[PDB]
Amino acid sequence: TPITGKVTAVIGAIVDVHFEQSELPAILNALEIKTPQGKLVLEVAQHLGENTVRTIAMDGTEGLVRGEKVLDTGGPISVPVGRETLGRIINVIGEPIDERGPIKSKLRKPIHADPPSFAEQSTSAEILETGIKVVDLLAPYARGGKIGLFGGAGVGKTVFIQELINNIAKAHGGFSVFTGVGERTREGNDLYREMKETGVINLEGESKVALVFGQMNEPPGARARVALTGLTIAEYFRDEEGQDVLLFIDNIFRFTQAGSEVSALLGRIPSAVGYQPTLATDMGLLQERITTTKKGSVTSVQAVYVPADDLTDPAPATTFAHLDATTVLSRGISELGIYPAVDPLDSKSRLLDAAVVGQEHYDVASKVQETLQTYKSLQDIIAILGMDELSEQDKLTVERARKIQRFLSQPFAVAEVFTGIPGKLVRLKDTVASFKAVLEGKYDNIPEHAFYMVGGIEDVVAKAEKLAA
């Protein structure tokens, strides 16, 4: 309903309204303050009573007079959804920023949506292939699986997500949703250009990819509801349309950080170190809003930034609950000259427990993990003295484990340029074969340079030819 108000205060970027009549809105309703600038959309988070609410600000609060009108839309901020959301870029107020005008829609929906219940559940967990070696072996993707990557940008957080799109999105077909939660401006423009160049999106033709991008000059309340805006679009596809979809998310640390900034202001006492008290409920909603239904099925890949590389920090910890597979990428490994930078000892998938990836694949991956863990154990002794001041058996073990570490480097294919080595696309089926041979000593007799930046089995042979000459 229409509810007039005036802006009593603007304390931080958590404005307080004082309504001029006895009608009052519910919590999570949306309000607009009229200025010759545009609008500011703010969203009720508390009622502090005496007809004074406190509202989250999705627009910077510059130039706000006290005693200035506000109006009530009468519900939560409404995005536009449809199959005419494709080829588009959507911000957070449901308005384009790629300027193709008014976003054609049949239903406009509230950004908050009550999560899918535990009666709509697909039991699916079928293998989907990444086309990256490390990933196929250590933590192969799944139809129901949720993957997350942690640690700070090494190879570039974004860039990894680009390879994933290059490989998985041209062989999964159908719809894909990208939601970038307070992601850097320049990077979105480069991707938009690439999709049209590679004929995925076209604004003159079809668009089987849809897009949501925010901006990291936007205020904290806004960057927090970039995530929800994409998520509304995703549900529409999964359910109403019933299509199987992807999701990619980069950077979802930024959701948590945006929440932590507003947490203080609202009138909350936060948790230790600084993070929000509502972290568990809120993280719960997002990851139960991406939960498979018995219509379509989805697979998600999420990027998390750590400002210390400490996954025991409270925000990376809560992520872990909602993940059944991970592919941690560590800064250390990038610095050493290994791309990709996957840590191999902090990898997991749910299907890697048993013969859920087949017995042969499980034997090869089980032994790989053992060899590298021994290599990590003998790291001190190697540093302190060396390997010839160890036992003869051990010396082989160390040398074998040194070929494995190097072997894992696969050249990127939409970042071939950046690595500087022409990309290798190494199959799930091939990765099992290549790794089998290497464990039995069949390529462990030729240089540690014939393992430096190689793909499958064939390439190892070919880098020997080079070195010889």
Partner: protein, 53 residues
């Protein structure tokens, strides 16, 4: 001759062990330093959170 090269080699090996071991010493100094700063920081926040309510 064999023995002399062996005790000599051992001396060299054990000298090279001190250079490497020092480098490990200096690294664990920085580890101790980072750790101290976090312990002090986190303790403050908890006292503050208590005063604040």
């Amino acid at each position: 001759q064999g023995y002399a090269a062996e005790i000599s080699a051992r001396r060299n090996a054990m000298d090279n062990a001190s250079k490497n071991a020092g480098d490990m010493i200096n690294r664990y100094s920085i580890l101790y330093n980072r750790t101290r700063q976090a312990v002090i920081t986190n303790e403050l926040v908890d006292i503050i959170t208590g005063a604040s309510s």
